[PDB]
Amino acid sequence: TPVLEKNNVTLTGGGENVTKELKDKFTSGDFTVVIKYNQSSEKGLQALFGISNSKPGQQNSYVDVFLRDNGELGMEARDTSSNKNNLVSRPASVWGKYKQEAVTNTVAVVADSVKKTYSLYANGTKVVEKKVDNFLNIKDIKGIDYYMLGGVKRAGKTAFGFNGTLENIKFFNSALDEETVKKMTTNAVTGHLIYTANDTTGSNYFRIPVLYTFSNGRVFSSIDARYGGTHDFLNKINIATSYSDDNGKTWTKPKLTLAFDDFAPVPLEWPREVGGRDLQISGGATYIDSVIVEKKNKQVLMFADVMPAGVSFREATRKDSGYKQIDGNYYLKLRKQGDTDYNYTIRENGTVYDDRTNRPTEFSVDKNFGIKQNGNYLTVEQYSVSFENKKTEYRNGTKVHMNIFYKDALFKVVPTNYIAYISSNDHGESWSAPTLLPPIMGLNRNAPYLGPGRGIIESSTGRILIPSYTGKESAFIYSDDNGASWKVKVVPLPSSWSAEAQFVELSPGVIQAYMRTNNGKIAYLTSKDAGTTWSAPEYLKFVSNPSYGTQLSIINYSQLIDGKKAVILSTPNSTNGRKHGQIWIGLINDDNTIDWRYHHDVDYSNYGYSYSTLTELPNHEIGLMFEKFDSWSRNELHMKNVVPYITFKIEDLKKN
Numbered sequence: 001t002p003v004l005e006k007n008n009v010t011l012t013g014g015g016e017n018v019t020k021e022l023k024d025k026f027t028s029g030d031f032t033v034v035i036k037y038n039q040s041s042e043k044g045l046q047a048l049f050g051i052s053n054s055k056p057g058q059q060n061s062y063v064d065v066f067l068r069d070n071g072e073l074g075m076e077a078r079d080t081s082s083n084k085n086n087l088v089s090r091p092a093s094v095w096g097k098y099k100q101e102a103v104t105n106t107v108a109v110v111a112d113s114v115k116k117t118y119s120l121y122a123n124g125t126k127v128v129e130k131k132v133d134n135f136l137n138i139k140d141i142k143g144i145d146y147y148m149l150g151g152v153k154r155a156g157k158t159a160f161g162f163n164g165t166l167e168n169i170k171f172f173n174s175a176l177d178e179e180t181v182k183k184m185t186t187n188a189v190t191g192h193l194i195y196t197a198n199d200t201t202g203s204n205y206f207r208i209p210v211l212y213t214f215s216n217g218r219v220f221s222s223i224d225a226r227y228g229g230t231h232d233f234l235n236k237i238n239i240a241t242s243y244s245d246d247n248g249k250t251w252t253k254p255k256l257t258l259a260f261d262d263f264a265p266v267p268l269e270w271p272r273e274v275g276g277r278d279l280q281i282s283g284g285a286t287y288i289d290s291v292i293v294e295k296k297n298k299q300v301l302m303f304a305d306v307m308p309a310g311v312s313f314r315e316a317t318r319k320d321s322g323y324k325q326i327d328g329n330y331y332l333k334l335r336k337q338g339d340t341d342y343n344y345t346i347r348e349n350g351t352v353y354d355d356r357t358n359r360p361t362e363f364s365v366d367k368n369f370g371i372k373q374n375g376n377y378l379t380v381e382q383y384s385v386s387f388e389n390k391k392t393e394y395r396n397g398t399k400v401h402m403n404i405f406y407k408d409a410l411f412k413v414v415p416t417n418y419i420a421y422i423s424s425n426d427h428g429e430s431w432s433a434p435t436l437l438p439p440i441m442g443l444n445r446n447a448p449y450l451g452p453g454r455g456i457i458e459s460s461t462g463r464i465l466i467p468s469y470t471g472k473e474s475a476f477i478y479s480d481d482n483g484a485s486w487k488v489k490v491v492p493l494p495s496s497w498s499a500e501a502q503f504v505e506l507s508p509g510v511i512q513a514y515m516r517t518n519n520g521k522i523a524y525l526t527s528k529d530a531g532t533t534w535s536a537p538e539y540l541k542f543v544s545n546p547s548y549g550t551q552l553s554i555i556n557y558s559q560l561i562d563g564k565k566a567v568i569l570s571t572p573n574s575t576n577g578r579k580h581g582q583i584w585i586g587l588i589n590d591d592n593t594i595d596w597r598y599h600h601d602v603d604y605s606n607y608g609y610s611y612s613t614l615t616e617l618p619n620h621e622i623g624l625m626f627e628k629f630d631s632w633s634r635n636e637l638h639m640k641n642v643v644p645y646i647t648f649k650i651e652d653l654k655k656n
């Protein structure tokens with residue numbers, strides 16, 4: 001039970017002395033503090049409480065828990081005379097505002113001198129636990145004489161003044177156990193996660209959210225389940241899905257939808273320290289960056305990039321499709337172990353052919369790229385990962401089918417990237433086996449890289465359009481036969497853009513592709529013939545981002561706003577990083593120019609905001625899922641439970 005509990009303490013920098021209440025309560029020196037608070041101003045460094053030596057010369061002798069204006073939660077524990085200075089923290093731990101209101105967060109700190117660890121919790125998640133060599137509890141700091149809410153008394157002055165309301169604050173004179181404190185910090189923020197660390201997927205990490213609303217009124221999500229931290233590469237990544245049959249209120253437990261099993265779907269504690277965060281899973285095959293579209297006949301497509309083990313955006317040969325042309329048909333090449341050339345193709349029924357003799361072999365390749373010999377599966381041992389800061393990838397005794405995308409395969413595909421698609425006839429309950437896309441860029445070129453989010457059906461032609469990019473060009477993958485066959489329009493860009501794009505239709509036959517660039521701006525290209533030819537790029541005047549850029553989301557909206565047809569855009573908007581998420585409403589004019597009339601800031605401007613996805617809910621509200629952190633920063637790698645789902649009414653989005 002609490003040694004002290006206070007409530008509804010509103011403050012604006014000044015703090016409140018509780019020295020009389022807490023002096024003499026902390027017998028061992030260990031402590032737990034749980035704080036339910038909301039901020040009225042996020043600016044500056046703010047302490048939720050402070051325990052200090054207030055006397056002159058002793059300003060580096062204190063304990064506190066602090067909040068930064070970018071959502072970082074941390075704690076310090078410092079002693080002047082021994083020059084001991086502990087700082088434990090994690091970025092992107094709290095929420096600032098939501099729809100014009102200060103957000104209530106619940107955070108906690110645990111100091112355990114037996115373990116020599118400081119632990120921090122926020123909103124149901126243990127955001128960090130750190131064993132420290134120079135551990136300090138309250139009794140270890142010389143001359144503690146001052147205990148304060150909403151600041152730290154340093155040399156008789158109030159430092160780090162907190163602005164807001166401490167709704168409830170509990171001080172305990174012992175280290176409370178992990179599961180209790182997780183429970184105490186659980187609140188409404190906790191329930192905005194669809195995908196959670198070590199849920200049904202087995203993944204501790206997630207990135208690249210996608211939302212889509214189907215014609216039947218189901219709302220559907222896909223996401224990258226990234227098992228080896230959040231690294232784009234190298235990594236072990238599956239695509240997970242989850243859906244809602246009630247306008248987004250409740251969601252199904254996540255299922256794996258695209259996955260390889262050369263590594264198992266298991267939780268790994270990826271090291272965040274500078275010395276380990278660069279580590280990667282190197283040996284594992286991957287699906288990455290999903291795109292969803294619903295056809296006119298209500299069948300659903302999902303596309304994803306496919307990386308064989310060892311291959312990424314970085315390693316993939318750019319000069320080979322992985323396909324061969326034989327009598328006007330395209331067939332995937334394979335290289336057998338011990339050969340240097342690619343002497344084999346996969347042809348009809350998955351039969352592996354020796355191209356030299358033009359004869360079928362005894363080998364075949366199944367619908368999931370698994371290898372058979374005489375109609376029986378070849379096997380390989382699955383890998384596990386183990387730590388200590390010593391990472392090892394090792395064979396674990398479990399047998400899985402040998403696969404042409406694996407490290408230990410007898411027959412291997414060219415080490416480049418591919419695109420695969422799967423189809424569903426039951427709005428995402430079940431999915432067909434993956435089909436690899438044919439060499440639409442040419443035989444001597446790797447496939448493009450998907451622009452995550454959604455594709456579209458252009459209404460005047462029924463053309464299906466899937467966005468992708470090469471690093472130098474936009475690659476608009478399309479089908480004019482309701483998805484039976486695919487072509488591409490390649491459009492050279494002004495520079496080396498990572499041209500992650502999304503489409504909107506302005507009017508029949510007129511589409512725009514809005515995309516990331518390498519120049520700091522969002523570009524948009526216009527076609528007035530349903531995607532066949534594209535104008536020169538124009539740029540939005542009101543977004544200004546770092547040169548590297550970030551993925552965006554833009555969707556058509558079904559209902560009139562101010563009597564006009566509308567589009568809705570989600571993007572970060574800050575030259576300081578992947579920060580300052582905004583939702584913009586653009587109203588289409590009769591001449592097909594857009595009036596960008598409204599914008600809404602999702603949280604405060606220094607809070608993290610990376611990849612995002614929008615959908616129109618059946619009730620005509622808006623669903624938003626996004627990466628509430630900076631996914632470019634090397635400081636914000638390998639963080640759990642940082643991809644929330646939130647919703648807006650149009651009237652909410654009109655404000656800011």
Ligand SMILES: CC(=O)N[C@H]1[C@H]([C@H](O)[C@H](O)CO)OC(C(=O)O)=C[C@@H]1O
Binds near residue numbers: 233449
């Ligand atoms: C296929 C792949 O690697 N996709 C990744 C993409 C890509 O590497 C970049 O476009 C190269 O320029 O980068 C990012 C990113 O947050 O910046 C996320 C994607 O998951």
